[model samples]
Target: SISSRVKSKMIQLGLNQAELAQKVGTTQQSIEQLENGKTKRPRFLPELASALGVSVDWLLNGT
Candidate 1:
């Protein structure tokens, strides 16, 4: 799942979920939901990618 991928990137970059949420203009709950596989679609993919230093395509398809 993309959520797992997101989690992996988060760890690879040494960022906690809360930190990522803050950087992406989202809540820690939202990032938790994403990492826990509770959210299938993200509303702020662009912001998320930028915050994580990843491409949107990488976030979506891990390409």
Candidate 2:
């Protein structure tokens, strides 16, 4: 899933789930839920990508 890359990027920025969630405009609980399960249709993915300094295109996959 894209969770791995997200996790790595979060860690790279020294951002905890709560902090990243706050930055991306979501709740920490939801972020963890997305992390554990797969991001089938992440509503906040656009903002998450922006917050994480990644491309929405790249954040969707390993490429």
Candidate 3:
């Protein structure tokens, strides 16, 4: 799941959702939604990936 991968990566990077939200120009709730799998098609995927230091494909499909 994207949520699982995101949470794992966040831990590996030592980042909280709030920090990632700030970095990605999104709200903490938005990050929370992604983390909880509430968001299926994220609009800011590119920014999220950049902020998370990952690729969009990896973020979406774990490839």
lDDT of 3 by residue, 1-63 (tens): 787787787888898777878888977778777867777778688898898788988887786
lDDT of predicted model 3: 0.81
Relative to the true structure, how large is the alpha-carbon lDDT of every model?
0.81, 0.81, 0.81
Q: What is the lDDT of residue 3 in candidate 2?
A: 79
**Which of candidates 1 and 2 is the stronger one according to lDDT?**
2
Query: Going through the candidates in order, what is the number of backbone clashes in each?
Result: 0, 0, 0
lDDT for each residue of candidate 1 in 1-63, tens digit (9 for 90 to 100): 887777787888798777888899987778867867765567788999899888888887786
TM-score of 3: 0.83
Clashes of 1: 0
Across residues 1-63, which tens digit of lDDT does each residue of candidate 2 receive? Answer: 777778887888798788888899987877877877755668798898888888888876658
Off by over 4 Å in 2: none
User: Highest TM-score among the candidates is held by which one?
Assistant: 2
